[PDB]
Design a protein around this nucleic acid. Sequence first.
RNA 1: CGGGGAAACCCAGGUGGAGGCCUGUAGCGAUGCUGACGUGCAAAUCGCUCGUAUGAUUUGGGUAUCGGAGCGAAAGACUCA
RNA 2: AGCAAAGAUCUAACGGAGAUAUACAACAUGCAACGUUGGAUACUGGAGCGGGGAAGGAUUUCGUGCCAACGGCACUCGUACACGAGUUGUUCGGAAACUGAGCACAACGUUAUAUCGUUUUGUUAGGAAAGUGAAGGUACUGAAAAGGGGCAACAGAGAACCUGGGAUUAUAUUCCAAAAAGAAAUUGCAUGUGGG
RNA 3: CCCAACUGCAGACCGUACUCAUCACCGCAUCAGGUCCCCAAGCAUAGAAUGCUCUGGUACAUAGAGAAAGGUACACUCAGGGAAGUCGGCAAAAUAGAUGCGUAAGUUCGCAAGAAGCAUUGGCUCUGAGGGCAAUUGCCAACUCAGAACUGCUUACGGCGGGGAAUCCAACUGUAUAAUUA
RNA 4: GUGGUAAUGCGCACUUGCCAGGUAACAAAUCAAUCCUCCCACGGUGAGCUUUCUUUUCACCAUAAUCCACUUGGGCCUUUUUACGCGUUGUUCGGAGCGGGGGCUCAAGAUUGAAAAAUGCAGCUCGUACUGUGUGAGUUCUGCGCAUUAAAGCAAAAACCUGGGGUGU
RNA 5: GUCCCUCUCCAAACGAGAGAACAUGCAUGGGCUGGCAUGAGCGGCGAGGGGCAGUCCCGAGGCGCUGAACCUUGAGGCCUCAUGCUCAGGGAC
Lengths: 75, 49, 122, 48, 111, 50
Amino acid sequence: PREIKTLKEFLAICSRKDARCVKVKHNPSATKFKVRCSRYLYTLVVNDKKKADKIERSIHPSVKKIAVTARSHAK
Amino acid sequence: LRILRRLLRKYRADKKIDRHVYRDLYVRAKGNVFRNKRNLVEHIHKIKN
Amino acid sequence: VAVRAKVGSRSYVRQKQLAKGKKVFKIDCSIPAADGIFSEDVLGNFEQFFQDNTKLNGRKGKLSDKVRLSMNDNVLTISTTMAYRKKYFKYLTKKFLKKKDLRDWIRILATGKGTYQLKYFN
Amino acid sequence: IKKAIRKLYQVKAVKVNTLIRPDGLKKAYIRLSAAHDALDTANKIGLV
Amino acid sequence: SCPRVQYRRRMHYATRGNRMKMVRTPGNKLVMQKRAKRSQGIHTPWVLGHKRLGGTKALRHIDARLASRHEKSVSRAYGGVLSHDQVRDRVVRAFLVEEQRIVKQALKEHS
Amino acid sequence: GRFKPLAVKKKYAKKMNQNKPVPYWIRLRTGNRIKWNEKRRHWRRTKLNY
RNA sequence: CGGGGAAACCCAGGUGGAGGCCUGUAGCGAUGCUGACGUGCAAAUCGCUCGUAUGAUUUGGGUAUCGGAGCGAAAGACUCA
RNA sequence: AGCAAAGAUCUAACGGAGAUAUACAACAUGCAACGUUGGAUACUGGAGCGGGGAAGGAUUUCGUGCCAACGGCACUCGUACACGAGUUGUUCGGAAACUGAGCACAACGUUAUAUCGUUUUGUUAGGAAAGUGAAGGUACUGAAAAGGGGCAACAGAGAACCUGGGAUUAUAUUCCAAAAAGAAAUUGCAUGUGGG
RNA sequence: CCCAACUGCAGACCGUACUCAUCACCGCAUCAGGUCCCCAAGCAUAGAAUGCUCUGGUACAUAGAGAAAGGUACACUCAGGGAAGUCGGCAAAAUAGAUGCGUAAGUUCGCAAGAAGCAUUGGCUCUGAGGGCAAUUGCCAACUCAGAACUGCUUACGGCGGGGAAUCCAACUGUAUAAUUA
RNA sequence: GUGGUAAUGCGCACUUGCCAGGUAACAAAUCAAUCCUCCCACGGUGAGCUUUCUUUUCACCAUAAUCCACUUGGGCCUUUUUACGCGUUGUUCGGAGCGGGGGCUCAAGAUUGAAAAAUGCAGCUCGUACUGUGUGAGUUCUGCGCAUUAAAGCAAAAACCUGGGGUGU
RNA sequence: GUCCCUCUCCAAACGAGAGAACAUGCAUGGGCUGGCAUGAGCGGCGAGGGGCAGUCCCGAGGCGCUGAACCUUGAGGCCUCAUGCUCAGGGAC
């Protein structure tokens, strides 16, 4: 897994061809944006709940956006 | 020894004791001269006197 | 343990002191009090039980106020400047229920971080 | 086994796990891609 | 109370290559995990004394191959082979011995 | 053990097939002799050493 | 480290952890009961007792040397009861 | 004769043909024994009647049925018997591809006869065993490299993957499929952008 | 054509069950024999000795009734005497842990030696000594040893040397007749 | 290619034409000791006990690979010169450079993040949502070798690695 | 009438024997007789010790209730000193 520091990366990576998903995890202290691309899983830690929502909109509607939640025994 | 070695390091670093008297005690602490930590200290305070 | 202990010093053992402030525990008796299995008598006995049987330093029955025991409303509260384990008040309650022999009926389980709740068995 | 499953049944097999029974016969578990339904090709043959 | 553990890699004998960690997993279970054999690291030549070099990591097979060339060596001449003292003796010998010839040769020719 | 050549594995594969009992109908062939299989086997006795 | 002596060296307290060294498990053996058993649990086993247990030690896999021959710290031992 | 080492079983309800089985009450006229579950008591006592592997075995594993024979007593149980099923790998072990004590194919020599000997002290053969190609000229020209081929390690060398699971009657670092429960490592080739 | 970070597609072969043993192997067998490796809890204790125990695993070894003689035993005891027994102290008994004092001849100076022998030991309530850290002072852990007062012994788990005076032989450790001689 | 007085730092190329050296590669005892186990401490959840006693007894309290950014032990450089001093439990060391200040590097960790709570476990609520999450005794990974008694001195090769020289020129 | 079943123990390896046959026979209890050595629980003497300011606790032992508690016929002691059980004894020659 890899870390994203600047936000000018999280725009580039999402706009790469391979990235098939962006998983968005909500934590009390921060929210994770987990970009799933082929080799690595790129994540972005915001830490400020205001800035987080605004980023979650800027993500291009092209890429899937999964809300990461607890999944029970669906299977 | 590990108790007697560390009390001499702690004095020489606090300059309660010379490098010359340190080496005079260090070698004796190995010679079973000092029966315990309180015995070492009484002998130092007796040298300063 | 630095100073070696003594027997005979087992009377009045020091207990750690909570330096920040008050700590407060609750015992919620509402459910069984409603059905009459408790009465105003047993609630007067339940508070008294802790008043008599909680042991502050080594000794029980004498609590100066570093710990205060209040029956306000139907819920028992224990406010303490001392450091107690909440586990220990779950202990005294069970030990009270076994004198009344209510213990095949009323169970206690932790509803909230500072409180226990008397209930019934399925 | 990946090729002959493309010939016979015209379905791509993403994963194959071969095995050899104690009987000498070589079983295979062919996983055919999620664009394809294996319950479809089954009734195209058998099955129940 | 000491959960007891089992080998996993198909080799059950314990030699210097099969050495095993104990591991408590997020499922809370103990596990043998194989340690990795570790190289003794880059050394000076045996004849000169076998002491290890500086600025050179202990990387092992496929660890030494995938690492950048700098972790295995040093920039001055004979980087990943000789220590600095063995370099400056071969720098000095190359010089002082070469002139002892240039002087002893001229004398013979001059004579 | 876990180890085996494949050539050896098959020889035990064949010998597992041969342990089946004699079919019921094959007793009813006209002029039949075979009743129960005389070559049957159990690992507890007469061990194949393959 | 200290004490003695002109010298040469000699005494005493610690540290250190040597040995085909001693007690003692596992291990490897197999002394005594001339014990059990002696148509057995067993075509040599069992019980307590006993030898050794940092070494000329014990042990797995592989590999080498055999029939008038092999191998033997030597007993005509052993070489698939 | 005997079936006497390893302490040991007991009770209730349910199962089962195995019963509570009778020509003027019940004991005195259906005995003993079996499985599972709950309870009780006890043993092993981490050098284990614990959990996994090699050698060896090779379906004994797993589920359903079943009691003829077999488990030297007994079974309703079984490692019996019958009928179905079960062993999933880019990374785990081997092999592809290491060398060791060693082995013996070629070669040579012996022998009436190879079914004999030599064959790692750096290495076969009186012995011409290199099929590779530096530099250069455009698939020729010839520097350089002495000592043929192979086997021998599932405990030495070497080896890129980890946990989670509701994924099972039985296999799993083997299975899981778009939120792969997921996270990585590495080999080969290939296009694209960046540089040379 | 090379290099760099990504991406795309592919990643073949064989084993994989179960067993590893008071029933799965060898010993004619589900035989008290034999058989390599890994993991290894709590308390007493010097402890992988030995005793009991939580997790795991077992109640399977043909059973029931049951006081004969005679036996076997990984079972005990005995008045008085104490080797008179017997080829012979065979077998049994005995000794025993730890701490202190003490210890002969002989000697290759290493030993002999745990020679021999004497004494102490519980329980309880205290006391002393043995340190770390932080800035003389303050706060703290983990144990061991010694001493005292009071009080008790029915000498009371398991485990654990009998010792001394001499002769013969081999210097010693070792090996050695698998199944009568170590 | 390029920085630092230096130990060495930073990420155009090709080198199995040739050569040289490394890794692979082996080693006692003492002391310290990793993962991990046990025990104690803290106290959270459930359970056991309750005539009396027990702030109680029992169970659980977990974080895999991979990839990022202070301490301990060694080798070393520069500086100031040392003939008594530094240092270990321990049989040591120094003008062939001890000790001190300041640095370079290596080994084993600690720490903060990515993975990662979305998982695991337990409890509870009317097949769902919530709640909880040590200067102790062992331990051979390691320190650790030109490394053991030794008339014992403790395998080899593939594969990889860096350099010399050269190519680029 | 004898034998079996049943109950007893002067008998007994199994047979056999002595006996009983609604019988203080059996069961339990009481009392004797005997063994051990003063139970659990509780309460105001104790080397010392800890709190709070003399008290209230910690403490092996000790003292009182306490020759107390428990055991006492069973392979099989005593006393009818009490109650309980039996309700056509069954079967075979």
